[PDB]
Design a binder for these strands. Structure first.
Ligand SMILES: [K+]
Ligand SMILES: [K+]
Ligand SMILES: [K+]
Ligand SMILES: [K+]
Ligand SMILES: [K+]
Ligand SMILES: [K+]
Ligand SMILES: [K+]
Ligand SMILES: [K+]
Ligand SMILES: [K+]
Ligand SMILES: [K+]
Ligand SMILES: [K+]
Ligand SMILES: [K+]
Ligand SMILES: [K+]
Ligand SMILES: [K+]
Ligand SMILES: [K+]
Ligand SMILES: [K+]
Ligand SMILES: [K+]
Ligand SMILES: [K+]
Ligand SMILES: [K+]
Ligand SMILES: [K+]
Ligand SMILES: [K+]
Ligand SMILES: [K+]
Ligand SMILES: [K+]
Ligand SMILES: [K+]
Ligand SMILES: [K+]
Ligand SMILES: [K+]
Ligand SMILES: [K+]
Ligand SMILES: [K+]
Ligand SMILES: [K+]
Ligand SMILES: [K+]
Ligand SMILES: [K+]
Ligand SMILES: [K+]
Ligand SMILES: [K+]
Ligand SMILES: [K+]
Ligand SMILES: [K+]
Ligand SMILES: [K+]
Ligand SMILES: [K+]
Ligand SMILES: [Mg+2]
Ligand SMILES: [Mg+2]
Ligand SMILES: [Mg+2]
Ligand SMILES: [Mg+2]
Ligand SMILES: [Mg+2]
Ligand SMILES: [Mg+2]
Ligand SMILES: [Mg+2]
Ligand SMILES: [Mg+2]
Ligand SMILES: [Mg+2]
Ligand SMILES: [Mg+2]
Ligand SMILES: [Mg+2]
Ligand SMILES: [Mg+2]
Ligand SMILES: [Mg+2]
Ligand SMILES: [Mg+2]
Ligand SMILES: [Mg+2]
Ligand SMILES: [Mg+2]
Ligand SMILES: [Mg+2]
Ligand SMILES: [Mg+2]
Ligand SMILES: [Mg+2]
Ligand SMILES: [Mg+2]
Ligand SMILES: [Mg+2]
Ligand SMILES: [Mg+2]
Ligand SMILES: [Mg+2]
Ligand SMILES: [Mg+2]
Ligand SMILES: [Mg+2]
Ligand SMILES: [Mg+2]
Ligand SMILES: [Mg+2]
Ligand SMILES: [Mg+2]
Ligand SMILES: [Mg+2]
Ligand SMILES: [Mg+2]
Ligand SMILES: [Mg+2]
Ligand SMILES: [Mg+2]
Ligand SMILES: [Mg+2]
Ligand SMILES: [Mg+2]
Ligand SMILES: [Mg+2]
Ligand SMILES: [Mg+2]
Ligand SMILES: [Mg+2]
Ligand SMILES: [Mg+2]
Ligand SMILES: [Mg+2]
Ligand SMILES: [Mg+2]
Ligand SMILES: [Mg+2]
Ligand SMILES: [Mg+2]
Ligand SMILES: [Mg+2]
Ligand SMILES: [Mg+2]
Ligand SMILES: [Mg+2]
Ligand SMILES: [Mg+2]
Ligand SMILES: [Mg+2]
Ligand SMILES: [Mg+2]
Ligand SMILES: [Mg+2]
Ligand SMILES: [Mg+2]
Ligand SMILES: [Mg+2]
Ligand SMILES: [Zn+2]
Lengths: 159, 53, 104, 62, 149, 183
RNA sequence: AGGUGUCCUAAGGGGGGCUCAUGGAGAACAGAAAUCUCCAGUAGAACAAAAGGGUAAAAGUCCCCUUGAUUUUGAUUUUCAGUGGAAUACAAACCAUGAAAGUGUGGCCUAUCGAUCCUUUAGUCCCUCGAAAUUUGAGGCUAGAGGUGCCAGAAAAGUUACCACAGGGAUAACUGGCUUGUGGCGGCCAAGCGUUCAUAGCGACGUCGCUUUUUGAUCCUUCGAUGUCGGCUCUUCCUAUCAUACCGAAGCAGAAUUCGGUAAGCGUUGGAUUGUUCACCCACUAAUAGGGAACGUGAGCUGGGUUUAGACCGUCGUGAGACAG
RNA sequence: UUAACUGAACGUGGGCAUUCGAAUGUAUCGACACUAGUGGGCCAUUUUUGGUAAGCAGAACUGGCGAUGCGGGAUGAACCG
RNA sequence: AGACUAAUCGAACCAUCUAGUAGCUGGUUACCGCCGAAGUUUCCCUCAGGAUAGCAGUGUCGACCUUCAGUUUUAUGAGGU
RNA sequence: AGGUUUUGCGCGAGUGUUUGGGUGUAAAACCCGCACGCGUAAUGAAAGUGAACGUAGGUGAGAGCUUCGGCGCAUCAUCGA
């Protein structure tokens, strides 16, 4: 049985970067969170209270509780042949709102106006994404862009 | 040993129980013997009842 | 390790239910009675022939013990018990340490 | 007298035989572990809403 | 076979040797095909290849069963709501990738071909560029279809 | 080779009764014919429940029927593929008509004494061959003493297998914090 | 490559002011090193202990006040079967500090510890001693302490050469198999030795190989058994040639010698001491070469040694007994 | 909870497919009950630790043999098909 | 001499307790059809043995529940080889 | 002998004749009913106490039926009594 402590193996993960020590920006304490938000976890080494375990560093979850100085988050952990639901308490210095769902929240309101604009006008539109398609036919002119002929080069010693 | 969810057993069969086992194959036979004795007893007490108050 | 002889902390007495002043002493176990049911049973089992009937412990490893403080309320005369960590030397009411007076 | 110490050789394949199951979600999650001060009041709020929306057929007319 | 290429071949419906299917090339399908490179050969079919494959080896998936299409009534009662009513329509929808390509191609049971009549190249598990039979040979796929069909 | 995950997979549901009752076989022949020659979804459901075992056909009481005869169901026909039992708690029986697999002696007597009538499942097919104006009722499946023992474990609040009840039977270590821990 | 079974009434809690290690330049005794002043100084100092992380109007340092190291129970995290030290966020009380916002449920974070049965203390003033009451005594209900270091937790000294049973080739002591460090044998380069003269005869510093007649390393076969030292007797095989045939080279005048090639056809001994393999002497001879064949060869012999049971000595042990003496 | 019907959670009523808002497959959806055998493993490409090395000793992902025949590698548990 | 005590002695012979116990070796009786493993996790005076989770079979029930996935694409996080 | 899950059967808020008695074509078959066992109520160490605010509650799903407005079994998730 090897050594297995709470913070074993976190030499580089929990460290602050080069030229990024000292004071914490105060906009961290001014954000607001609501039950149902989507946040990601990133441990700050300079705060030793409300720290999450090293497994959750770099994960994304959903808020389920709000208290005076922390939030409760729900994450799913894989243990061999199943998933288990975990609930962790994290101080707000370690959490951050996520941009994972912003693309979806932007397409939903853009689809609403395009649908209503088209319905008012009378011409149908697409309203869903498509993967990149193969290119089409086109003509390329040789005028004042004459091609340059290349050939492989002989071997030579550099040093 | 135990291997699943069971009720913990307590069977008192750790003595030489096979030396003291009483079957009853004479249940109908003993019933006939009792009825014959009652019939004989009633005849001896000729007009009297077969019981006491 | 030394602790003061008095301390004020919560009291659970029916009349106090607040912080009051307490006197601090050290806990000492009492002597085993000869009429406890565990003792009466043990004597009966050991009589007659057969020898020693129960285990006797031999392989000790601990060198210290946990200290237990006994506190008493100055108002209602109720008592508390508080355990400490393992220590080698202990006294209550010793001289407090001084600072900046290094004289060797 | 010496044998093998540890291995993980066949463990992944055994895990995927009956699939790796993600528990199904529900519409109403449980309120276990939420702030009790919030929970005490939220009970009263749902109670009052129940008293109304029923007299809404016997008066009030919200 | 390793687990990732195995899963992809199941989604392309290629679960047996000498099976063939039609797919439409986009960004989402070109990456799947690149992964299973040492198991497949592919290219660009022409009208003759599309025509003869469906005429000779065409089977339909009706209520879970594999049914040979010997009559136009079979096609109409399964693809009629998309405007396809005859076998000539089905060929047109495949060869010119139409608005209902997904439905038409999934109706056809995967083709079961034979081994080629003239055999393969001397070592067939190299890339076509190296001298093998794997990968993308573009319009040379037509010569291989003649021998297998 | 074909590279398939499954092969020769069998069905998970019964296809015939396991009983050998002669009259139940006649009943099954009747509803096999009805289910094939009618579009009514009602007939297919009744056929499946005639295959089931006794723990999948829990009984239904007169009280449970009276609960569902409210809010505009006063004149529908109650159908129960099970036994119908009596309830001592109910003091006044409403009038109704019920088609059931069987009735207990007191259940049948109380239904008819209030002005109702009892049917058999073959009388029902003759009067309502499509199941019109009916309501299907099931009894409580999990209200069985054996189900209380299922899935026992830590922090599960299930019932244990013990031979008696009292202070000396599994109440000391693992059940309270004054002896070690609790569950 | 290292650490733990402790240590602290402050080295715990709150508030306030200040800036550290080191360098340059100056001042009676005073100097490399005492105390005083100015300038520069991103932490190069300090924070009980091992190492890693963290910290500058502080988490360092000095000053002032205190005991959140307190009460009642639940939820969550790590090891994990999601069973049994340590940690996180709230709720309900009572407090401490600061003008205040706030902070405080022990040590800046990651280690610093213990079930059932029994004993003992604190708590309510509570339940029971079953014919009825009162006082002593005993028994229950809730929380700590006395300990299991083999640390999910028996109460425990040797010998057997007089020996026994169930098994194991999952495991040693002999052949065989892979390897070749070590042992043995053979090459390459050329500073130098050789009277001058690298290579007649040699080869320092380096470097490439071969063999399985040394010894190691491993544990694949054999423990319902493959007879375990040496000599005697007898046959055959290998060449890395001791003698014999025919030749090349020399620091080869002759004689005697030294280096090399083709070559295993033919030989390679009689004795004193030792159980010896190995060794060392006397003597003859053309010469008294090196090895394999289950370390060839016990239903071929022999039985000197080793290695059962009898017996003596020395050293060791209280003793029974031990010793590759 | 806020100086404050200001917020927080849960909702009534109304509006929005003129399109329920990437690709492919669905040759196998969910939940429960009762129980067997096993708990000596070995081999290989790539990555790797100790050792001069070993048909030596120890790990990670994946594929095999064990539990499996057939055509090749003359023979040859594990190599190619 | 651990020598002799009826071919038996580092504790004779005869009957009974007795079918003494064995985590250890050996054996374990017709055919066809369908499905099909493990040598791994945690605890144990545990290391040739058990319990516990996993892998496997059988019986079903709920709807035939727009339901899922050892995969690609698009947007967006974490990591110190 | 004592447990447990699943299949078939009888009766069903109850269920079980056979310790015993009556009777007989006599170890069979047939008949009887006072007690008793399990179930119908739990929770505490114990003294003890002991299950409806509501059409036996509200919300989201839900087979079947429907006068097409809706009613909603079994079961699952959730807030309460
Ligand atoms: K280590
Ligand atoms: K005794
Ligand atoms: K072992
Ligand atoms: K091991
Ligand atoms: K105790
Ligand atoms: K220490
Ligand atoms: K302090
Ligand atoms: K440090
Ligand atoms: K724990
Ligand atoms: K132990
Ligand atoms: K310990
Ligand atoms: K242990
Ligand atoms: K002994
Ligand atoms: K010996
Ligand atoms: K053997
Ligand atoms: K073997
Ligand atoms: K060598
Ligand atoms: K050798
Ligand atoms: K060797
Ligand atoms: K060996
Ligand atoms: K042997
Ligand atoms: K000799
Ligand atoms: K041999
Ligand atoms: K010999
Ligand atoms: K001797
Ligand atoms: K308000
Ligand atoms: K098992
Ligand atoms: K097992
Ligand atoms: K093994
Ligand atoms: K091996
Ligand atoms: K072969
Ligand atoms: K004799
Ligand atoms: K064993
Ligand atoms: K690095
Ligand atoms: K039964
Ligand atoms: K009764
Ligand atoms: K419906
Ligand atoms: Mg580590
Ligand atoms: Mg006595
Ligand atoms: Mg005595
Ligand atoms: Mg093992
Ligand atoms: Mg495998
Ligand atoms: Mg030909
Ligand atoms: Mg070829
Ligand atoms: Mg086949
Ligand atoms: Mg301070
Ligand atoms: Mg400060
Ligand atoms: Mg507080
Ligand atoms: Mg400090
Ligand atoms: Mg702390
Ligand atoms: Mg203790
Ligand atoms: Mg006690
Ligand atoms: Mg008495
Ligand atoms: Mg043996
Ligand atoms: Mg072996
Ligand atoms: Mg050498
Ligand atoms: Mg010279
Ligand atoms: Mg040399
Ligand atoms: Mg043998
Ligand atoms: Mg032999
Ligand atoms: Mg022999
Ligand atoms: Mg030679
Ligand atoms: Mg020569
Ligand atoms: Mg001699
Ligand atoms: Mg040899
Ligand atoms: Mg020999
Ligand atoms: Mg021989
Ligand atoms: Mg001898
Ligand atoms: Mg001897
Ligand atoms: Mg002797
Ligand atoms: Mg002596
Ligand atoms: Mg085994
Ligand atoms: Mg290995
Ligand atoms: Mg091995
Ligand atoms: Mg095997
Ligand atoms: Mg194979
Ligand atoms: Mg072959
Ligand atoms: Mg070969
Ligand atoms: Mg004799
Ligand atoms: Mg036997
Ligand atoms: Mg025997
Ligand atoms: Mg199969
Ligand atoms: Mg133990
Ligand atoms: Mg064995
Ligand atoms: Mg459903
Ligand atoms: Mg289905
Ligand atoms: Mg690293
Ligand atoms: Mg009788
Ligand atoms: Zn007090």
């Amino acid at each position: 049985g090897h050594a297995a402590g709470l913070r074993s193996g976190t030499r580089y993960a929990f460290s602050r970067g080069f030229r990024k020590h000292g004071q914490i920006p105060l906009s961290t304490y001014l954000r607001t969170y609501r039950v149902g938000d989507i946040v990601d976890i990133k441990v700050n080494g300079a705060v030793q209270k409300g720290m999450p375990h090293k497994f959750y560093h770099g994960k994304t979850g959903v808020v389920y509780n709000v208290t005076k100085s922390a939030v409760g988050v729900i994450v799913y952990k894989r243990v061999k042949h199943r998933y288990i639901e975990k609930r962790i308490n994290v101080r707000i210095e370690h959490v951050k709102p996520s941009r994972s769902r912003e693309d979806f929240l932007r397409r939903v309101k853009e689809n609403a106006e395009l649908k209503k604009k088209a319905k008012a006008e009378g011409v149908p539109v697409q309203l869903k994404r498509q993967p990149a398609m193969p290119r089409e036919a086109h003509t390329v002119s040789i005028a004042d862009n004459k091609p340059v002929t290349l050939a492989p080069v002989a071997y030579e010693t550099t040093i | 040993a135990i291997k699943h969810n069971q009720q913990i057993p307590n069977n008192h069969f750790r003595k030489h129980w096979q030396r003291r086992v009483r079957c009853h194959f004479d249940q109908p036979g003993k019933k006939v013997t009792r009825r014959l004795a009652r019939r004989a007893k009633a005849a001896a007490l000729a007009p009297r009842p077969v019981d006491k108050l | 390790v030394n602790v003061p002889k008095t301390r004020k902390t919560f009291c659970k007495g029916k009349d106090c239910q607040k912080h009051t002043l307490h006197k601090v002493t050290q806990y000492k176990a009492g002597k085993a009675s000869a009429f406890a049911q565990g003792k009466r049973r043990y004597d009966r089992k050991q009589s007659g022939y057969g020898g020693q009937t129960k285990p006797v412990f031999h392989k000790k490893a601990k060198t210290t013990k946990k200290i237990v403080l006994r506190l008493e309320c100055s108002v209602c005369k109720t008592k508390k018990q508080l355990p400490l960590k393992r220590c080698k030397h202990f006294e209550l009411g010793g001289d407090k340490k001084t600072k900046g007076a290094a004289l060797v | 007298a010496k044998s093998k110490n540890s291995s993980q050789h066949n463990q992944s394949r055994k895990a995927h035989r009956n699939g790796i199951k993600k528990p199904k979600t529900q519409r109403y999650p449980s309120l276990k572990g939420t702030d009790p001060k919030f929970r005490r009041n939220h009970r009263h709020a749902l109670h009052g809403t129940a008293k109304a929306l029923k007299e809404f057929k016997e008066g009030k007319r919200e | 076979i390793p687990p990732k290429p195995r899963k992809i071949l199941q989604l392309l419906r290629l679960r047996q040797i000498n099976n063939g299917v039609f797919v439409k090339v986009t960004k989402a399908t070109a990456e799947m095909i690149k992964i299973v490179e040492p198991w497949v050969a592919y290219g660009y079919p022409n009208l003759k290849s599309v025509r003869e494959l469906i005429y000779k080896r065409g089977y339909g998936k009706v209520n879970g069963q594999r049914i040979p299409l010997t009559d136009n009534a079979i096609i109409e009662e399964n693809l009629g709501k998309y405007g396809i009513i005859c076998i000539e329509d089905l060929i047109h929808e495949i060869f010119t990738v139409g608005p209902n390509f997904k439905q038409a191609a999934n109706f056809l049971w995967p083709f079961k071909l034979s081994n080629p009549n003239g055999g393969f190249r001397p070592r067939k598990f190299k890339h076509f560029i190296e001298g093998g039979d794997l990968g993308n040979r573009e319009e040379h796929i037509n010569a291989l279809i003649r021998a297998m069909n | 080779g074909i590279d398939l995950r499954w092969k020769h997979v069998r069905s998970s549901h019964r296809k015939a009764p396991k009983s050998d009752n002669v009259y139940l076989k006649l009943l099954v022949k009747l509803y096999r014919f009805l289910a094939r020659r009618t579009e009514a979804p009602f007939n297919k459901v009744v056929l499946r429940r005639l295959f089931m075992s006794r723990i999948n056909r829990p009984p239904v009481s007169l009280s449970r029927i009276a609960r569902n005869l409210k809010n505009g169901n006063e004149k529908k026909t109650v159908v129960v593929v099970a036994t119908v039992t009596d309830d001592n708690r109910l003091l006044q029986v409403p009038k109704m008509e019920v088609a059931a697999l069987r009735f207990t002696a007191k259940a049948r007597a109380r239904i008819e004494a209030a002005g109702g009538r009892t049917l058999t499942l073959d009388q029902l097919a003759l009067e309502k061959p499509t199941g019109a104006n009916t309501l299907l009722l099931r009894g409580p499946k999990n209200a069985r003493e054996a189900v209380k023992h299922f899935g026992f474990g830590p922090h599960k609040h299930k019932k244990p297998y013990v031979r008696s009840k009292g202070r000396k039977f599994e109440r000391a270590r693992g059940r309270r914090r004054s002896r070690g821990f609790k569950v």
